[PDB]
Design an enzyme around this catalytic site. Structure first.
Site, short mmCIF file in Angstrom:
data_model
loop_
_atom_site.label_atom_id
_atom_site.label_comp_id
_atom_site.label_asym_id
_atom_site.label_seq_id
_atom_site.Cartn_x
_atom_site.Cartn_y
_atom_site.Cartn_z
N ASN A 1 51.33 4.18 47.42
CA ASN A 1 51.66 3.19 46.41
C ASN A 1 53.11 3.34 45.96
O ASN A 1 53.82 2.34 45.78
CB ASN A 1 50.71 3.31 45.22
CG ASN A 1 49.30 2.86 45.56
OD1 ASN A 1 49.10 1.84 46.23
ND2 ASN A 1 48.31 3.61 45.09
N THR B 1 37.40 2.56 56.12
CA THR B 1 36.31 3.11 55.33
C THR B 1 35.02 2.31 55.44
O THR B 1 33.94 2.90 55.52
CB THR B 1 36.76 3.25 53.86
OG1 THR B 1 35.76 3.94 53.11
CG2 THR B 1 37.08 1.89 53.23
N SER C 1 44.11 -6.09 48.99
CA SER C 1 43.56 -5.45 50.17
C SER C 1 42.57 -6.39 50.85
O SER C 1 41.71 -6.98 50.20
CB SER C 1 42.88 -4.13 49.81
OG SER C 1 41.56 -4.35 49.33
N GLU D 1 65.78 -17.45 50.52
CA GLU D 1 66.29 -17.24 51.87
C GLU D 1 65.37 -16.33 52.67
O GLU D 1 65.80 -15.39 53.34
CB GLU D 1 67.71 -16.68 51.82
CG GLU D 1 68.73 -17.63 51.22
CD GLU D 1 70.11 -17.01 51.14
OE1 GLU D 1 70.25 -15.80 51.43
OE2 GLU D 1 71.07 -17.73 50.78
N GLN E 1 41.16 -3.79 44.10
CA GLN E 1 41.39 -2.42 43.65
C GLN E 1 42.70 -1.88 44.20
O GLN E 1 43.49 -1.28 43.46
CB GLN E 1 40.22 -1.53 44.07
CG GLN E 1 40.32 -0.10 43.58
CD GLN E 1 39.11 0.73 43.97
OE1 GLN E 1 38.19 0.25 44.62
NE2 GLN E 1 39.12 2.00 43.57
N1 LIG Z 1 47.47 0.87 50.16
C1 LIG Z 1 46.38 0.99 49.41
N2 LIG Z 1 45.18 0.48 49.86
C2 LIG Z 1 44.06 0.60 49.10
C3 LIG Z 1 44.11 1.24 47.87
N3 LIG Z 1 42.87 1.22 47.34
C4 LIG Z 1 42.04 0.58 48.20
N4 LIG Z 1 42.76 0.20 49.30
C5 LIG Z 1 42.24 -0.53 50.47
O1 LIG Z 1 41.13 -1.32 50.08
C6 LIG Z 1 40.09 -1.23 51.03
C7 LIG Z 1 38.73 -1.35 50.35
O2 LIG Z 1 38.75 -2.32 49.32
P1 LIG Z 1 39.10 -1.86 47.82
O3 LIG Z 1 40.53 -2.23 47.47
O4 LIG Z 1 38.88 -0.38 47.68
O5 LIG Z 1 38.08 -2.65 46.87
P2 LIG Z 1 38.29 -4.21 46.52
O6 LIG Z 1 39.42 -4.80 47.33
O7 LIG Z 1 38.55 -4.34 45.04
O8 LIG Z 1 36.89 -4.89 46.92
P3 LIG Z 1 35.50 -4.26 46.39
O9 LIG Z 1 35.33 -2.90 47.04
O10 LIG Z 1 34.36 -5.16 46.77
O11 LIG Z 1 35.55 -4.09 44.89
C8 LIG Z 1 40.27 0.12 51.70
O12 LIG Z 1 39.97 0.03 53.08
C9 LIG Z 1 41.73 0.46 51.51
O13 LIG Z 1 42.44 0.30 52.71
C10 LIG Z 1 45.32 1.75 47.41
O14 LIG Z 1 45.37 2.32 46.32
N5 LIG Z 1 46.45 1.63 48.19
MG LIG Z 2 37.15 -3.46 43.84
#
Ligand SMILES: Nc1nc2c(ncn2[C@@H]2O[C@H](COP(=O)(O)OP(=O)(O)OP(=O)(O)O)[C@@H](O)[C@H]2O)c(=O)[nH]1
Ligand SMILES: [Mg+2]
Ligand SMILES: Nc1nc2c(ncn2[C@@H]2O[C@H](COP(=O)(O)OP(=O)(O)O)[C@@H](O)[C@H]2O)c(=O)[nH]1
Lengths: 430, 432, 55, 280, 100
Positions: free
Chosen positions: B221, B172, B133, B247, B11
């Site tokens: 982002n 979170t 992530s 490089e 995500q």
């Molecule tokens: N920098 C950044 N980090 C994000 C963003 N969205 C989610 N995260 C990170 O992703 C972590 C949680 O996982 P998610 O990306 O929300 O969900 P996922 O990686 O698809 O995994 P699932 O929740 O099982 O679907 C959070 O602790 C955030 O730190 C974003 O838009 N920008």
């Molecule tokens: Mg997800």
């Protein structure tokens, strides 16, 4: 699309689901005639989650109504929003339970459960990708606590992979409504720990306390009661129905809130709750939310959450909020409540965001927690059961329907075992 | 002639991909609908369809369809290739086991087929970029399966990971240490270059400099997008000192096991006080090495420096760059390692940074993006190991892994693998 | 006996119900609002500080 | 020490306790009623609108020399109920096509909902506008009730679609313009049904109404039904012939009778009366 | 005049448009899919379609009919001659009609 199907039995669950469906129809802009008149396109991409599509352009809730007597079901069909449900999802017996667990679970329940099992099956293969099951019932009565839990066991048998949550209205020692809750209450709670993946508890006494202290409404009825519990119902599944910055399905909530397979009992709360006076006088802000949603007197059961330590907690924000304020509020309330939280696991709090506020609201917070304060309710239940079982009171109408004291003894022992293994974590140190 | 393929899994990967490609499509002058107004500098990221619009060389992966169909309903429904937005049916629900051992195969095969098709059209592929992530189940799991599959499909081809690790206290989930350790185990032997992208440190940067109390993930982002654009502008814009992605594994990787680093950028400024400040090359060089300006929660004062690749864009002067480097070396509070006498790699680009309307950053004439590999990065690994093992001691949250099809032993090998990695970092830091 | 005006009393004099979440409500608040961050940020391009700002 | 819920309580008018909250709740209840009156969704306005549009005034066209001719507005009355037929548009039948129920009502006052128009179904050899026995026509509703034309029709009996109470053949006011509208008059007595064909139909006489695609006669019973407009009966199609059987086939073989002539009596139920206006 | 629109061509066109909506989404659906465009652009909420509105709907649903054939089908559909089509009547004709 990861849709969830509703089942309810007994007049308790019937009322709960009837008002919950009214809430969802209002949220999605569905008339009691079943025709959509919403404003957004955003209400239509996730209609399949709760509503199936029928001929004539109308929608039908995917709900099952089961009972051993037709009175409450004839009442709900006559009530408002009673035309949404298909006539085929009504199943009723001509005898009733009479608050007898054996009648609802062994004799009439077994012979009647065939039809309800068939209809729930055909509806389940009806959907493409099934997500899970939710059940609403009361353990203090006969037909619900028996037939519902028998269906729970059966459905868990034929579907070991899916996720299943239940909403249990438990008897409160203070507000007494029947003479024989503890027996069938223990009998039901015994059969829940092995099958229910998620169970969350609601209590009439504490929910009355909410209505009379926070809302300060002079003469509440069962209607606003069911309204509160239905708001709690809908607040948890918002991410599965609407876009958000942090989506989280029921499986995520489970795996993220439950440490051990037998600790799947949960305490819930809803915010912001206010009296009828200060709607325009108090500012809706994330700090005020996070303050109120950790008020112990905001929970819906007599258990005092200040008497233990929280294992895991989760907050599901609704509306357009900045993520930081949520994050720092969670961490600060974690830091100044170190003594009230378990120490051996760090950061035992979930924050989830959905960007659609409820009807008539700008922000909302739903809290779900697993705490060692829930077991006090089972101490009352166990003490009542032991006291009324020692003299063998009212045992014989149960045992005259194929029951004997073996199951009563095993249920009592298992519930005490659950209490013991739940309390031993309270004083555990790493 | 030269192209780089981008992968957005998880995500967070999706929401960073949206912002990065909005930034690139605005700076290339291509409209969201896809065709140039017309009123060879795009071949790196955009591919001509033959007549009119340009086809993205990017891929999007996720097991839950909300973000995918939301993008499909967004402004870039006319831009993105239809089925390169691969979406699953069931979310992994923060579970590494679900994404790595039951349902990852039904989607990884499709993704590999898609990347076959995209690489076949490409003729001068330079490398791969991966966005994900760590603290997410599907993110980590699918990023894993993709990395071992591409590691044997390609081999020598370069890959860079702009990966988001969980923050020390600002996080979170509750179970993120587990899948974090497993993801690091999976990627440390498969990723040529991996950077830190935690969130709370950049949140602090925004609060300090942009003077905001209420930002959201969109700003994060966007700024990560600007960092990526600054890094990749050298391959598509003219400059006095051009630096390729090749490089990186030859200048920032002293040892194969040490390929984790952290990024920083300067200057960050709003539109109100930009015109009242200097914004000189020496000042933007000095502020880039300021300890609180790090995009990752890591203190460079607690460890030595190994290699820094820092690139300028605008009208910078090489003599001024050398003078700034000399002043940096003269300063005492920054100390490098003995066996590395020279550890600066500088590139120069003549294209000024782009500014997105409605964004926080203002229009500037000079900018520098710096990537530093330091021995102090072991602190985050140590704290993550603690957050792991304290709850790992008594079999907590383990059966949702093991009964899903995961074997109970892998957490061990992850433990001693990370222990040996930390021992490697603390062994390298000693003087010779 | 009331018949027609019985609607008024059932509507205003404690009918055995509560009216459509208006206890939950927040001058005039039905105001069903919806807009997602992506649907607002990258497309209509409103300033991120100018979003939220609760009202 | 202000404490609430103090046993006996007065109205919100007194200041005993918890009066402010009650008074504010009462204020907001009528303010929600203010919303309901601001946005035109009042149930009272709906019921008044329906009643006023149902009970509008209308003029029946006068009949000269007591001969019905196409285009007049006449009353249709079941004699056995001694009651006039009306239509309930607001109630919707259970069908994919839009159709509305018709019921017979005792009250006979001229109303918009109770008036009907006679229209030529198809071009016929009869150029003159006087209607004749056994000539197909279509009954139409007053333009005042609905801008779209609505026709009275029926479709063959199905277990899928049977009457709610009578369980017999339906009659429905629908938008269908097909052959189902084909309705024909018939003279009452058994002896002269055949020979009365081709003769002018005169108002005030006891007549029979029969559908062409089904050859079924329209009639009504003391069958109870409930709607907005009081308590009303049912109108449907059914053959209320006398039960005793007669040897029509053997009479055919001998040669005493031919099919077109009827042999079975029908009861008084099936009778209907066309009512014209009293004064011109 | 070059030609007048013929009944068999009308039947072919209606069969094509009748089949095209089946291909999308699922069997029970396509009624909500047709209703949803009407909701998207019927601002007055009166419930009346027009010639240009039907042209737009066909252009959205991958059906570029001639102006002349579109007039022919419009005239065949409407008997009121008011140049307006009831949405429910159009839906019933296109979806629920035993005859071709
Ligand atoms: N920098 C950044 N980090 C994000 C963003 N969205 C989610 N995260 C990170 O992703 C972590 C949680 O996982 P998610 O990306 O929300 O969900 P996922 O990686 O698809 O995994 P699932 O929740 O099982 O679907 C959070 O602790 C955030 O730190 C974003 O838009 N920008
Ligand atoms: Mg997800
Ligand atoms: N919240 C809520 N609780 C209810 C409702 N109806 C009954 N109850 C509770 O259910 C308890 C009695 O349950 P019972 O009717 O015997 O359950 P059954 O035997 O399964 O039908 C009472 O103590 C009530 O507090 C309702 O509509 N809402």
């Amino acid at each position: 699309m990861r849709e969830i199907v509703h089942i309810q039995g007994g007049q308790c669950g019937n009322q709960i689901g009837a008002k919950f469906w009214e809430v969802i129809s209002d949220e999605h802009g569905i008339d009691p005639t079943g025709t959509y008149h919403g404003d957004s396109d955003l209400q239509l991409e996730r209609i399949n989650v709760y509503y199936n599509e029928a001929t004539g352009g109308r929608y039908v809730p995917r709900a099952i109504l089961m009972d051993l007597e037709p009175g409450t079901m004839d009442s709900v069909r006559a009530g408002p929003f009673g035309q949404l449900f298909r006539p085929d999802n009504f199943v009723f017996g001509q005898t009733g339970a009479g608050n007898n667990w054996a009648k609802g679970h062994y004799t009439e329940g077994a012979e009647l459960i065939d039809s309800v099992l068939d209809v729930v099956r055909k509806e389940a293969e009806g959907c493409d990708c099934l997500q899970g099951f939710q059940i609403t019932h009361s353990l203090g009565g006969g037909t619900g606590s028996g037939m519902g839990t028998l269906l729970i066991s059966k459905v868990r048998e034929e579907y070991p992979d899916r996720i299943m949550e239940t909403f249990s209205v438990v008897p409160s020692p203070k507000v007494s409504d029947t003479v024989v809750e503890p027996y069938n209450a223990t009998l039901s709670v015994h059969q829940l720990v092995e099958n229910a993946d998620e169970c969350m508890v609601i209590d009439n006494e504490a929910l009355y306390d909410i209505c009379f202290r926070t809302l300060k409404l002079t003469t509440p009825t069962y209607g606003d009661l069911n309204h509160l519990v239905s708001a709690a119902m809908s607040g948890v599944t918002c991410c599965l129905r609407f876009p958000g910055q942090l989506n989280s399905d029921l499986r995520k909530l489970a795996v993220n809130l439950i440490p051990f397979p037998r600790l799947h009992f949960f305490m819930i709360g809803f915010a912001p709750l206010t009296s009828r006076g200060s709607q325009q006088y108090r500012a809706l802000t994330v700090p005020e939310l996070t303050q109120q949603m950790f008020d112990a007197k905001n929970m819906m059961c007599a258990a005092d959450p200040r008497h233990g330590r929280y294992l895991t907690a989760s907050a599901l924000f609704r509306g357009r909020m900045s993520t930081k304020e949520v994050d720092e509020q969670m961490l600060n309330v974690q830091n100044k409540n170190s003594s009230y939280f378990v120490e051996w696991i760090p950061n035992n709090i979930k924050s989830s965001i959905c960007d659609i506020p409820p009807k008539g609201l700008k922000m909302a917070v739903t809290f779900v927690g697993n705490s060692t304060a829930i077991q006090e309710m089972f101490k009352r239940v166990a003490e009542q059961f032991t006291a009324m079982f020692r003299r063998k009171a009212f045992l014989h109408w149960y045992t005259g329907e194929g029951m004997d004291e073996m199951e009563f003894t095993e249920a009592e022992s298992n519930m005490n075992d659950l209490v013991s293994e739940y309390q031993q974590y309270q004083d555990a140190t790493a | 002639m030269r192209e780089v393929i981008s992968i957005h899994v998880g995500q967070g990967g999706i929401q960073v991909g949206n912002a990065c490609w909005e930034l690139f499509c605005l700076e290339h002058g291509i409209q969201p609908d896809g065709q140039m107004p017309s009123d060879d500098a795009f071949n790196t990221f955009f591919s001509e369809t033959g007549a009119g619009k340009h086809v993205p060389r990017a891929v999007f992966l996720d097991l839950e369809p909300t973000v995918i169909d939301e993008v499909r309903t967004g402004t870039y429904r006319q831009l993105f290739h239809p089925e390169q937005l691969i979406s699953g049916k069931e979310d992994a629900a923060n579970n590494f086991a679900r994404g790595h051992y039951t349902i990852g195969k039904e989607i990884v095969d499709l993704c590999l087929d898609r990347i076959r098709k995209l690489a076949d059209n490409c003729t001068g592929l330079q490398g791969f970029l991966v966005f994900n992530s760590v603290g997410g189940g599907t993110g980590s799991g699918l990023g894993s399966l993709l990395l071992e599959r591409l590691s044997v499909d390609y081999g020598k081809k370069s890959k860079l990971g702009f990966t988001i690790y969980p923050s020390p206290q600002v996080s979170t989930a509750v179970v993120e240490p587990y899948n974090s350790i497993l993801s690091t185990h999976s990627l440390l032997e498969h990723t040529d270059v991996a950077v830190m992208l935690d969130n709370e440190a950049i949140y602090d940067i925004c609060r300090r400099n942009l003077d905001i109390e209420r930002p959201t993930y969109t700003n994060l982002n966007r700024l990560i997008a600007q960092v990526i654009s600054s890094l990749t502008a050298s391959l598509r814009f003219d400059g006095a000192l051009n630096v390729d992605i090749t490089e990186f594994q030859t200048n920032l990787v002293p040892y194969p096991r040490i390929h984790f680093m952290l990024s920083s950028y300067a200057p960050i400024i709003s539109a109100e006080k930009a015109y009242h400040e200097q914004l000189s090359v020496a000042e933007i060089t000095n502020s880039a090495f300021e300890p609180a300006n790090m995009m990752a929660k890591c203190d460079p004062r607690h460890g030595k420096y190994m290699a820094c690749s820092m690139m300028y864009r605008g009208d910078v002067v090489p003599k001024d760059v050398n003078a700034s480097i000399a002043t940096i070396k003269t300063k005492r509070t920054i100390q490098f390692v003995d066996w590395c006498p020279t550890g600066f790699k500088v590139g120069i680009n003549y294209q000024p940074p782009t500014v997105v309307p409605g964004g926080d950053l203002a229009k500037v004439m000079r900018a520098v993006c710096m990537i530093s590999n330091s021995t102090a990065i072991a602190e985050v690994f140590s704290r993550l190991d603690h957050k792991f093992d304290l709850m790992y001691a008594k079999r907590a949250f383990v059966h949702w892994y093991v009964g899903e099809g995961m074997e109970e032993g892998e957490f061990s090998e992850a433990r001693e693998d990370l222990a040996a990695l930390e021992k490697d970092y603390e062994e390298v830091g000693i003087e010779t | 006996i009331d018949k027609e005006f019985n609607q008024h009393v059932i509507f205003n004099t404690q009918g055995v119900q509560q009216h459509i979440l208006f206890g939950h409500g927040v001058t005039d608040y039905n105001k069903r609002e919806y807009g997602t961050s992506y649907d607002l940020s990258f497309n209509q391009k409103i300033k991120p500080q100018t979003q939220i700002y609760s009202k | 020490m202000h404490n609430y819920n103090v046993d006996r309580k007065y109205q919100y008018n007194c200041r005993i306790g918890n009066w402010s909250e009650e008074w504010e709740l009462d204020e907001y209840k009528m303010k929600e009623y203010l919303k309901n009156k601001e946005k035109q969704k009042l149930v009272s306005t709906d019921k008044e609108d329906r009643l006023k549009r149902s009970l509008g005034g209308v003029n029946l066209s006068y009949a000269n020399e007591g001969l019905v001719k196409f285009g007049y507005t006449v009353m249709i009355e079941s004699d056995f109920m001694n009651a006039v037929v009306a239509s309930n548009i607001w109630d919707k039948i259970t069908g994919t096509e839009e159709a509305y129920g018709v019921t017979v009502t005792s009250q006979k006052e001229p109303i918009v909902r109770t008036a009907f128009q006679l229209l030529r179904y198809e071009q016929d050899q009869y150029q003159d506008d006087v209607i004749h026995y056994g000539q197909n026509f279509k009954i139409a509703v007053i333009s005042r009730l609905s801008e779209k034309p609505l026709y009275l029709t029926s479709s063959h009996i199905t277990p899928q679609k049977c009457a709610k109470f009578s369980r017999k053949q339906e009659v429905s006011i629908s938008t269908n313009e097909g052959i189902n509208s084909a309705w024909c008059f018939e003279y009452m007595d058994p002896k002269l049904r055949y020979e009365m064909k081709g003769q002018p139909v005169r108002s005030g006489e006891p007549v029979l109404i029969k559908h062409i695609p089904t050859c079924q006669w329209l009639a009504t019973d003391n069958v109870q039904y409930n709607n907005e407009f009081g308590q009303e009966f049912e109108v449907f199609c059914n053959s209320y012939q006398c039960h005793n059987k007669t040897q029509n086939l053997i009479a055919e073989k001998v040669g005493r009778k031919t099919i077109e002539t009827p042999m079975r009596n029908q009861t008084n139920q099936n009778t209907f009366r066309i009512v014209t206006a009293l004064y011109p | 005049d070059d030609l007048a629109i013929t009944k068999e061509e009308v039947k072919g066109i209606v069969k094509t448009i009748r089949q095209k909506l089946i291909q999308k989404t699922k069997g029970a659906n396509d009624e909500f899919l047709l209703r949803k465009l009407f909701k998207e652009f019927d601002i007055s909420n009166s419930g009346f379609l027009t010639l240009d509105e039907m042209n737009a709907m066909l252009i959205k649903l991958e059906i570029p009919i001639q102006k002349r054939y579109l007039n022919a089908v419009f005239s065949q559909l409407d008997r009121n001659h008011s140049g307006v089509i009831e949405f429910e009547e159009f839906v019933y004709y296109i979806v629920n009609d035993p005859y071709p």
